[PDB]
Amino acid sequence: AGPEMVRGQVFDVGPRYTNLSYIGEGAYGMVCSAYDNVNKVRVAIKKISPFEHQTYCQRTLREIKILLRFRHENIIGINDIIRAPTIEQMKDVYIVQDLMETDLYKLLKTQHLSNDHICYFLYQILRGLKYIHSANVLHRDLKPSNLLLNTTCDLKICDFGLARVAATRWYRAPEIMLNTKSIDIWSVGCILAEMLSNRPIFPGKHYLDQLNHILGILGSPSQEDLNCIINLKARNYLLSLPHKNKVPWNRLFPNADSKALDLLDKMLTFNPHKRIEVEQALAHPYLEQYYDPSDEPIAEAPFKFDMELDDLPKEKLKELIFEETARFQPG
Numbered sequence: 001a002g003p004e005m006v007r008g009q010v011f012d013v014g015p016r017y018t019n020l021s022y023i024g025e026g027a028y029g030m031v032c033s034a035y036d037n038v039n040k041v042r043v044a045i046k047k048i049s050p051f052e053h054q055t056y057c058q059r060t061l062r063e064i065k066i067l068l069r070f071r072h073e074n075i076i077g078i079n080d081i082i083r084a085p086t087i088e089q090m091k092d093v094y095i096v097q098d099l100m101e102t103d104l105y106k107l108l109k110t111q112h113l114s115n116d117h118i119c120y121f122l123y124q125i126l127r128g129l130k131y132i133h134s135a136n137v138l139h140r141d142l143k144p145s146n147l148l149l150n151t152t153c154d155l156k157i158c159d160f161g162l163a164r165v166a167a168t169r170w171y172r173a174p175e176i177m178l179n180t181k182s183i184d185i186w187s188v189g190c191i192l193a194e195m196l197s198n199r200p201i202f203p204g205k206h207y208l209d210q211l212n213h214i215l216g217i218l219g220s221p222s223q224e225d226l227n228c229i230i231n232l233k234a235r236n237y238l239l240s241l242p243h244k245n246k247v248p249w250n251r252l253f254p255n256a257d258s259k260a261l262d263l264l265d266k267m268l269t270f271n272p273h274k275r276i277e278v279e280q281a282l283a284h285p286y287l288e289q290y291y292d293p294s295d296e297p298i299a300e301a302p303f304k305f306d307m308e309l310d311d312l313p314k315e316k317l318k319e320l321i322f323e324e325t326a327r328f329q330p331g
């Protein structure tokens with residue numbers, strides 16, 4: 001048959017994986033649904049072409065290393081990895097994963113969620129995050145498009161490219177734009193708010209406008225909220241702004257559950273030190289119906305990269321990518 005093509009990208013995944021269809025995109029790749037003739041199921045195939053940039057190579061290696069060690073119901077896994085037999089011919093890497101039904105970005109673009117489903121989705125994000133954080137790892141890019149859903153409404157966290165050992169502007173914590181595990185909680189806060197109204201709570205266009213949108217609902221920050229190593233330009237901008245009143249949560253979300261708004265308030269806290277932790281959020285009365293610490297596992301040990309991935313050249317990272325994927329080759 002030969003190599004399959006989808007929206008301009010060539011996928012050399014045959015003869016095992018055939019009849020490919022478009023399901024997503026990334027900065028240096030494409031996601032496709034394909035038929036696996038061995039397991040007789042449709043699977044997801046993520047093609048990545050990162051070898052022209054050092055940043056894309058480390059983002060690829062970080063994800064592959066994290067997803068292979070992690071084993072959790074609310075985190076996407078790796079079933080198989082395809083690449084050329086030699087390093088000289090390895091221009092692409094194909095990550096084979098479980099095919100999902102939809103993602104939260106698509107679901108919030110077409111459907112209105114009931115409180116029970118908002119509560120069940122939030123629980124699963126935090127259940128998965130509890131495992132990520134227990135491993136001393138930060139996702140750093142939590143957003144509706146990185147939250148995958150199946151037919152039975154089971155959630156799975158994907159895209160561990162930007163993950164680091166303890167991004168999209170709209171779900172970015174204020175402290176990142178001023179100067180930790182709390183940055184993921186802020187993102188979950190933004191996701192919860194988007195589930196309640198089917199729209200982004202803070203749709204900023206640039207870093208200071210993103211802060212302006214946050215201050216537009218939270219109001220002007222206190223002295224303690226600004227007691228950190230702030231960027232001079234950002235500090236001088238915040239001090240030059242007129243007083244902003246705090247928009248109450250029940251006013252912004254009129255028909256939302258009062259318990260959901262209390263947890264939302266604790267997640268969308270300007271000061272990261274006063275922000276609720278993942279285990280504290282799971283214990284909140286809003287998620288009482290699903291809260292079960294006996295069925296909320298943690299990682300066996302903390303995760304650590306033996307090498308300084310940031311300092312390694314593009315060629316050295318390719319060698320490590322080639323070595324990490326060697327286990328999936330026949331022999």
Ligand SMILES: Cc1cnc(-c2ccccc2)nc1-c1c[nH]c(C(=O)N[C@H](CO)c2ccccc2)c1
Nearest residue numbers: 025026028029030044097099100101102103158159
């Ligand atoms: C593994 C998987 C399985 N099924 C589906 C899926 C199925 C049906 C409808 C929507 C998505 N998505 C995924 C999935 C979606 N995004 C990603 C995913 O890894 N996306 C990132 C960018 O966020 C990426 C990064 C670099 C190159 C390409 C892609 C995986």
